[model samples]
Target: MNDIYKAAVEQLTEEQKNEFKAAFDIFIQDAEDGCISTKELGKVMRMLGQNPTPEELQEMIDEVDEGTVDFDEFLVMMVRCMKDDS
Candidate 1:
């Protein structure tokens, strides 16, 4: 499989997952709907020092018409973004 996220997932430590979970908790108030807004996603990135611009978030809009990212979606996006960083 060409799942880029696999490597990112494998590379992450349990400690890193715990920290990511903590940060993700900051904006996940709508679990009843089962996702977080793209705006919220952008804010979380900033919390982690990513500082995504409006354009970066717009790029996300193309991928999700619902205007939110599933937490799993977030994991994949975060992994891809992190992989790109390295």
Candidate 2:
């Protein structure tokens, strides 16, 4: 992994890392095809207690890709969101 990603991973506690991985697994299961689609984005956000507007969600997807989000994209999204919250 790159330094930034390694740093981000290092910042998490072991329990947080495990929980994050478990959540990612769950998201992948919900995705049903190993990648998160725009449609699935809303559900995943809701699952995480986030209620982003359509435009906001669209903006996020635009940063990564056109229609779907892979695991790497998801990690970037998490990092961005965490930074935003801070």
Candidate 3:
């Protein structure tokens, strides 16, 4: 991983990692704007704790598609939820 990416993953909570993984999976397969490569997709998955649901995955994608959520906000929820899980 690149230095910045490594640091970013370190900062993420376990939940965030999982959510991001699910999001990345859907984004890689279903995103209409651009093609997401498997190698980059796997990098994102590595940061996750567990897989998220198909519904949640689609919701995140919808947020991205509709411009309701940015990557940073999505990541914040992902991390915050992990903290709340404890």
Candidate 4:
């Protein structure tokens, strides 16, 4: 849950805060680039078990693409479209 340093995780709601912390940090660990690209995002999506399709994944990428996802929107939408891949 620690990212070697603090971040805006508090900006997230209590419900998602706990869940996102692990996956988000895993995104960092897996990528280790300190950059949040659309592709990098899916790593978390997959790891989190969302399994969003490429089209669905790309769609979300553009939908939340205002100024950039930042921490809140990134994590929010990362899980926002997370349900119902069946």
Best by lDDT: 1
Q: Which ten residues in a row have the lowest lDDT in candidate 3?
A: 37-46
Tell me the tens digit of each residue's lDDT in model 2 across 42-78: 6665565556668877887886452787655665555
Winner on lDDT between 3 and 4 is: 4
Better of 1 and 2 by TM-score: 1
lDDT of 2 at 45: 53
In Å, residue 44's CA in model 4 sits off its true spot by 0.3
Q: Tens-digit lDDT track for model 4 on 1-85?
A: 3441134344446777667666666655455444466776767667767777788767877765552334555665655654465
Candidate 4, number of clashes = 0
lDDT of 1 by residue, 11-61 (tens): 667886777778887786645556777778887776776655687677755
- RMSD in angstroms, all models? 3.6, 3.6, 9.1, 7.1
Q: How many residue pairs clash in each candidate?
A: 0, 0, 2, 0
TM-score of each: 0.67, 0.60, 0.33, 0.60
Backbone clashes (count) for model 3:
2
Clashing pairs in 1: none
Candidate lDDT scores, in order, read 0.66, 0.63, 0.46, 0.60
Number of the candidate with higher lDDT, 1 or 3: 1
lDDT of 3: 0.46
